């Protein structure tokens, strides 16, 4: 068919604090749009974190690593965070809790 | 909330025309960058062309010459109409085209919002 497989629906990127103070420092203008594109075909495209409550790592810069977050009623994603390959790759319980609680506050600013 | 509608789309000749269009409404906000995606079914997509608020503009290879984006602001009070304007179209330009606004409302989110696309096919 002509459509490609996923999703058209308009559709809502939302960075946080964080995502946008080092997004630069990581993603070309062309990798963060062929990112955002990526999604918006297909949310469940990141890989599930557990005990986070749905958060998603995708991979794609190379070795950056996005972390995100879809909100199935109002089709925003929350881009949590963005790390570099090498760095900080070792996911211990802190961290899933805490990225749950942010993930939680943004979550209910829009009920 | 920020209003996205977006106009424009089908079926064409080649060397023919076609005008995509695309509407950001709402209240106020500072825009930063904007511009145009498209994705041919079996292969990764590409972007189409890019314009920073202040005119700074990039177009892809294949498009130069042939695509060009413009920009309405609406006294910059209101809303921002994106314009692709396709014209020599090549039969490589069919394609599912969306549209897409990096903007921040007064003490809000920076977000990057997205059309729900259109297909465009240039078929002889």
């Known amino acids: 068919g002509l459509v490609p497989r996923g999703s058209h629906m308009k559709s809502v990127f939302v960075e946080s604090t964080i995502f946008e103070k080092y997004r630069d420092e990581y993603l070309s203008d062309e990798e963060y749009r062929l990112f955002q594109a990526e999604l918006m075909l297909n949310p469940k495209l990141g890989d599930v974190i557990q005990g986070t409550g749905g958060l998603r790592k995708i991979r794609v810069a190379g070795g950056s690593r996005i972390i995100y977050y879809f909100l199935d009623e109002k089709r925003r994603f929350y881009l949590l965070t963005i790390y570099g390959k090498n760095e900080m790759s070792d996911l211990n319980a802190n961290q899933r809790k805490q990225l749950m609680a942010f993930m939680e506050a943004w979550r209910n600013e829009q009920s | 909330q920020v209003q996205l509608q977006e106009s424009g789309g089908g079926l064409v000749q080649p060397g023919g025309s076609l005008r995509l269009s695309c509407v950001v409404s709402?209240?106020?906000?500072?825009?930063?960058?904007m511009g145009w995606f498209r994705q041919a079914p079996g292969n990764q997509g590409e972007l189409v062309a890019t314009?920073?608020?202040?005119?700074?503009?990039?177009?892809?290879?294949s498009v130069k010459g042939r695509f060009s984006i413009s920009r309405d602001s609406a006294e910059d009070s209101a809303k921002n109409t994106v314009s692709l304007q396709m014209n020599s179209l090549k039969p490589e330009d069919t394609a599912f085209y969306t549209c897409?606004?990096?903007?921040?409302?007064?003490?809000?989110?920076?977000?990057?919002?997205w059309g729900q696309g259109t297909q465009v096919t240039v078929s002889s």
């Open positions: 314009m920073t608020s202040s005119g700074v503009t990039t177009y892809v290879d």
């Open positions: 897409y606004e990096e903007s921040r409302r007064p003490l809000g989110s920076r977000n990057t919002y």
């Open positions: 709402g209240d106020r906000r500072t825009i930063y960058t």
